[PDB]
Amino acid sequence: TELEHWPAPAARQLNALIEANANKGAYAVFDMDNTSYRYDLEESLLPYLEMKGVLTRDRLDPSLKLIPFKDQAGHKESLFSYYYRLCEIDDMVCYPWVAQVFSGFTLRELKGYVDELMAYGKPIPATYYDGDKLATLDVEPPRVFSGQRELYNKLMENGIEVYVISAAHEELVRMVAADPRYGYNAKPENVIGVTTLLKNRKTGELTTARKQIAEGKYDPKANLDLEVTPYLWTPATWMAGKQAAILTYIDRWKRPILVAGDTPDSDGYMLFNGTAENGVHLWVNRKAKYMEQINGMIKQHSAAQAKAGLPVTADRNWVIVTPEQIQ
Amino acid sequence: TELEHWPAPAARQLNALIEANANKGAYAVFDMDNTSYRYDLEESLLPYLEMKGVLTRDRLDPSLKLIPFKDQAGHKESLFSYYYRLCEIDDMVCYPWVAQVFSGFTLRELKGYVDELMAYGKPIPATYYDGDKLATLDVEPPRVFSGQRELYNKLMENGIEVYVISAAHEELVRMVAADPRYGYNAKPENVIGVTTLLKNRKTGELTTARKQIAEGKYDPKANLDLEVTPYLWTPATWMAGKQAAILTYIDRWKRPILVAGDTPDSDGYMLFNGTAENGVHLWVNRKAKYMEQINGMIKQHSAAQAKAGLPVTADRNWVIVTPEQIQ
Ligand SMILES: [Cl-]
Ligand SMILES: [Cl-]
Ligand SMILES: [Mg+2]
Ligand SMILES: [Mg+2]
């Protein structure tokens, strides 16, 4: 497997990293959304199911009705629009909510919709408030990066285990990352995302994949008909929770030799505190105001590592690509 | 302030650390329940509130009824019983639940109950299911540890900042650790705990203390008539979340020179991954099973640090005390 869809000097650094760390029990960690594929799964699945009439404001779990809807002018606010208004309160409100909003569905159902969104091939209209003006924007469905496909498999082929630490629902991510048809071939147990309690409709037993994996009795098939509930399981895999997730589910002391991300605040803990001393920081640059923010982070952390008497590793081994360079 | 309620060899080790780290920008982290005082706030407050009529299954948020209550022909399941039953599903179910259970009150009311509980001073009767049979037990309210009251102050007096990182509700913990009538004298902003969205009933505004502190304007009094809701803010401060909280709210690179704990799974991440190399692991031993569980972990982590090419720090500077010895 060749790093064919990669700028040549990135394919260079990455091949060197892989030769240096083949077959040594090393591991690598990837963000999913806008890192391993272009665009975002939850952000397109929400409006896509609203538009099918599958998700509607009145099916919404009452624990998620945090603030009043804004129905000014005989227009009924969409769930998409509401998500944005929560994001204005805070990331910490809106990050869980946009995983929880898919409550009430069985995994089997959600998998069918995920596959429909992946095969869709066309933008999805949504609405939202820009101040008080009702507005329009089109949301793209996920688009698998070919280069990431290549890198995931080439890491696994060289005995470097591959994990996904994503801020989106673990089970939604797993339906992309662990399904052979998308070309990642992640092991399902190595997908780490936001978790909520899964409920048995007949028995009312509550479980989660994380629970079953730690107990060594994980089989993704038997969770198919369980319902996604919104009750949150921790650690929550964003911000420092990404680093928490590495400690809890991967290794307490061995660091990843590669960490891939695209959102500065949310991926920045696993990137700066997580990556091994000589590991690669894989960055996908998709928003020039994020490029400048990450560069500001590299500077400031470099300086703060030094001032605390630590080797300066924050500026080491960046591999920076744009979405178009790996598409 | 003098370290008088300590065994002398511990007080020597602590005084020596305080002297080596005086006015150097150092800080210390303390668990609260069963570390800073004896017994547990939430576990005594919840059944206190039940035997007073304040907190009942009716005024229980519908988002927190995850399973059916188990009523036997003549007796109604208490909230303490249901709580034990959720612990048997997973700590990751019962840990947030027993914080969220205090929802639907204002911080003013709760500050009332806490000060009451702290003054109550006597054992509270509570009931649960031992297997399938109904059982009774005596739950004790917190008793402030004089030793810890002294250590906190001696640390502040030598310009060693003091933080509290608890798996109990941040606002509950604040009401004891920051309120000077208990003698800890912790800065309100330096108390970190499990956080839920606080609601302005008037306006519908949603905030949390962590938000206000991160934004640079925090006044505890401004919050007293906000309603505690159940909606969970992260990172959740238990297990690897405690280490996540150090990164997020304290410092990304500087490590505490003192970490204090009493629960091997919940406190282990900040104890082993957090504590500075030349820091003190301060351990309150309140259960025989926990003392050997932490000794087991110390060995395991020592070996795993060496294997990973790290300096072995896990077995270093253990200050071990019983509740009795610091009471
Ligand atoms: Cl993210
Ligand atoms: Cl704890
Ligand atoms: Mg991303
Ligand atoms: Mg404790």
Find chain A residues with C-beta within 8 A of B61's C-beta: 63
Burial of A253 (0-12, 13-18, 19+ CB in 10 A): middle
User: What is the experimental resolution, given in Å to one decimal place?
Assistant: 2.4
Q: What is the rounded distance in angstroms from the CA atom of residue B234 to the CA atom of residue A95?
A: 10
Domain final residue, candidates A141, A167, A185: A141
Question: B183 and B155 in contact (C-beta within 8 Å)?
Answer: no
**Where among B90, B106, B141 does a domain terminate?**
B141
A23 with A53, same domain: the answer is no
Question: Does residue B1 share a domain with residue B105?
Answer: no
β pairing state of A206-207 and A191-199: antiparallel
Mark whether A177 and A309 lie in a shared domain.
yes
Clarify whether residues B57 and B86 are in a common domain. yes
State whether B241 and A243 contact (CB < 8 Å).
no
Residues A123, A9, single domain; the answer is: no
Token match 């933008």: residue? A123
Whether residues B160 and B301 fall in one domain: yes
| Residue numbers of the domain that contains A238 | 1-38+142-327
Does A1 contact chain B (CB < 8 Å)? no
Q: Are residues B174 and B90 in the same domain?
A: no
Total domains in the fold of chain B:
2
Method: X-ray
Contacts with A239 (C-beta within 8 Å, 6 or more apart), sequence order: A91, A265, A266, A268, A269, B234, B235, B244, B248
Question: Are both A213 and A320 inside the same structural domain?
Answer: yes
Strand ranges (E), chain B: 27-30, 37-38, 124-130, 133-139, 143-144, 161-169, 191-199, 206-207, 227-233, 258-261, 280-284, 318-321
Matching residue, tokens 């996604």: A228
Is the domain of A171 the same as that of A299? yes
Instruction: Tell me whether residue B193 is exposed, middle or buried, using C-beta atoms within 10 angstroms of its C-beta: 0 to 12, 13 to 18, 19 or more.
Output: buried
**Nearest neighbour of A244 by CB, restricted to B206, B244, B310:** B244
Same domain, B47 and B187: no
User: How far does the CA of residue B105 sit from the closest CA of chain A (Å)?
Assistant: 16
Domain boundary among B141, B166, B192: B141
Is A31 assigned a catalytic role? yes
Residues B244, B234: Cα–Cα separation, whole Å = 9
Alpha-carbon separation of residue B152 from B21, B177, B319 (angstroms): 14, 10, 15
Closest-approach residue (CA) in chain B for A89: B206
For residues A258 and A295, is the Cβ–Cβ distance under 8 A? no
Q: Measured between alpha carbons, how far is A170 from A196 in angstroms, rounded to an integer?
A: 9
Pairing outcome for strands A124-130 and A133-139: antiparallel
Residues B132 and B161 in one domain: no
In the block, tokens 């309690």 appear at A197
Any idea what the CATH number is for the domain that residue A78 is in? 1.20.1440.310
Residues 6+ apart with CB under 8 A from A274: A29, A242, A243, A246, A255, A256, A259
B204 has a chain A CB within 8 A of its CB:
yes
Using DSSP, state whether A106 is helix, strand or coil. strand
The CATH number given to whatever domain includes residue A226 is 3.40.50.1000
Q: How many residues does chain A have?
A: 327
Q: Which residue of B has its CA nearest to A229?
A: B66
Rounded to a whole number of angstroms, the distance from the CA of B240 to the nearest CA of chain A is: 5
Q: DSSP per residue over B225-254, as a string?
A: TSEEEEEEESS-SSTHHHHHHIIIII-SS-
Nearest-CA distance A254 → chain B (Å): 6
Clarify whether residues B201 and B284 are in a common domain: yes
